[PDB]
Amino acid sequence: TGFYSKDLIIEAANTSYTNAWALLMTLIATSFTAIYSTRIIFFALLGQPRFPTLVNINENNPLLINSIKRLLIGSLFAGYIISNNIPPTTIPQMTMPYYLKTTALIVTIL
């Protein structure tokens, strides 16, 4: 559901008469998203546990299961329902297969 929201803006921004310094600054930020997203996983979740307190209880409640699992439908099918049903105006994807189109996906990988 990232390509159906984030990537459509980046591809459209490159084909414009607008400011060049503003365009270059957005490209660094798109690659900057990967740092703090992994700073939730690698820094706290992943690796050896830090052990916050001696004897700490953590258990799944019946109210928790009904909330998170039904949020997964909204976080996965968002690029199927919202993007397809809504009528758009003017298609942006046409020019630069490596400079504009690939740059949105390569920034997340690099």
Q: Which region, judged by CB under 8 A, interacts with other proteins, from 25-33, 68-76, 90-98, 99-107?
A: 90-98
**CA-to-CA distance for 63 and 65, rounded, in angstroms?**
6
11, 101 Cβ separation under 8 angstroms: yes
Residues in the interface with other proteins (CB under 8 A) total 19
- Under the binding rule (CB under 8 A), the answer on residue 48 touching other proteins is yes
**CA-to-CA distance for 37 and 108, rounded, in angstroms?**
11
* Minimum distance, C-beta of residue 84 to other proteins, in the bound complex (Å): 5
95, 11 Cβ separation under 8 angstroms: no
DSSP-based three-state secondary structure for 32: helix
- Under the binding rule (CB under 8 A), the answer on residue 34 touching other proteins is no
* Minimum distance, C-beta of residue 25 to other proteins, in the bound complex (Å): 26
Which residue ranges make up the site for other proteins (CB under 8 A)?
43, 47-48, 50-55, 57, 80, 84-87, 90-91, 94-95
